[PDB]
Design a protein around this ligand. Structure first.
Ligand SMILES: CCCCCCCCCCCCCCCCCC(=O)OC[C@H](COP(=O)([O-])OC[C@H](O)COP(=O)([O-])OC[C@H](COC(=O)CCCCCCCCCCCCCCCCC)OC(=O)CCCCCCCCCCCCCCCCC)OC(=O)CCCCCCCCCCCCCCCCC
Ligand SMILES: CCCCCCCCCCCCCCCCCC(=O)OC[C@H](COP(=O)(O)OCCN)OC(=O)CCCCCCCCCCCCCCCCC
Lengths: 171, 70
């Protein structure tokens, strides 16, 4: 069949978010609050195109928005954030319930200096709506032409011509 | 009298104290002074292998924070 069409290595180069999973988990709720729109454009493009090769520009916008998010954290509230993700990072399961005072420090400094509000319980799990400008994929499964079905039955059901026609049975 | 049973119970209690304190100090020794990462589920393992990739020294416990970005 056809040759698979991959993007080049220069199409995949982007400045990475080189932070740990506890760093990402510490500012996860503010990341969901502040980086909503390009992330949801990307995940809508990802569930509609069903192809990661059709989602590279949206992923690059995701990475750019995440980098601007952590640069906006680092300029204003770097030390309460470091105090908070170190305490998140200590735990094996990385509990949020173990670190509520460092969370209160980080959320206080973030609300005072950056105006960000941490979302309530239930908000990040909402199904939102996304205003895209790309067209809707007309055939994302690349489904070919379907086979035409067998013809249905029609007409009034007349009696059997001369019965069963079973050798001599006249009915 | 009855306190004569206490040296044996004390030795048995030290022998029960050694495995737990030992594995706690070993999990803090092999993980950078922290708890061992519990990866019961595949998302926790994906985050853990992402830590192993972003640390650069093939160790998940090397935490990289805001100093690793510009
Ligand atoms: C307004 C409302 C009121 C209207 C009223 C109208 C009616 C008035 C009269 C009232 C009574 C009606 C009776 C039924 C209608 C007539 C049926 C008929 O004669 O068909 C001829 C039928 C075919 O001949 P035909 O000249 O082409 O058709 C003339 C008509 O158009 C026949 O019409 P057809 O073309 O539409 O027939 C359709 C088709 C025509 O037939 C065919 O297409 C051929 C295939 C038939 C079956 C062949 C099977 C062969 C292998 C098995 C053999 C088994 C052993 C034989 C018997 C051993 C002894 C029991 O019939 C069948 O296939 C039915 C199966 C056979 C049963 C026949 C009816 C029996 C009714 C009484 C039962 C009493 C016991 C009888 C003995 C049991 C065995 C029959 O003849 C045979 O098959 C010969 C076998 C004997 C038939 C039975 C005769 C009926 C009267 C028996 C009275 C004496 C009983 C004595 C005591 C019991 C035995 C010891
Ligand atoms: C996790 C913790 C586990 C701990 C397990 C052990 C619990 C008990 C701890 C020790 C308690 C005291 C033990 C005393 C042993 C008996 C000593 C004794 O009386 O030895 C006398 C015997 C003869 O001496 P002799 O020179 O002939 O005397 C003439 C004097 N005019 O001399 C001899 O027989 C020679 C010397 C023998 C010395 C034996 C010492 C005890 C060995 C027991 C094994 C376990 C020890 C602990 C191991 C873990 C810690 C290092």
């Amino acid at each position: 069949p056809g040759i698979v069409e991959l993007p080049s290595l220069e199409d995949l180069k982007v400045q990475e978010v080189k932070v740990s999973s506890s760093v990402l988990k510490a500012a996860a709720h503010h990341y969901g609050a502040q980086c909503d729109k390009p992330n949801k454009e990307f995940m809508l493009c990802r569930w509609e195109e069903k192809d990661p090769r059709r989602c590279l520009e949206e992923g690059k916008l995701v990475n750019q928005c995440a980098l601007e998010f952590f640069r906006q954290i680092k300029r204003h509230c770097a030390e309460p954030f470091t105090e908070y993700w170190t305490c998140i990072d200590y735990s094996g399961l990385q509990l949020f319930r173990r670190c509520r005072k460092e969370q209160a420090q980080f959320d206080k400094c973030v609300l005072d200096k950056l105006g960000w509000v941490r979302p309530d319980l239930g908000e990040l799990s909402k199904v939102t709506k996304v205003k895209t400008d790309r067209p809707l994929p007309e055939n994302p499964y690349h489904s070919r032409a379907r086979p035409e079905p067998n013809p249905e039955v029609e007409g009034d059901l007349k009696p059997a011509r001369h019965g069963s026609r079973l050798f001599f049975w006249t009915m | 009298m009855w306190f004569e049973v206490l040296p044996g119970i004390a030795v048995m209690g030290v022998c029960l104290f050694i495995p737990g304190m030992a594995t706690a100090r070993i999990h803090r020794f092999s993980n950078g002074g922290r708890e061992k990462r519990v990866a019961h589920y595949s998302y926790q393992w994906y985050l853990m292998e992402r830590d192993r990739r972003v640390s650069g020294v093939n160790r998940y416990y090397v935490s990289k924070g805001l100093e690793n970005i510009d």
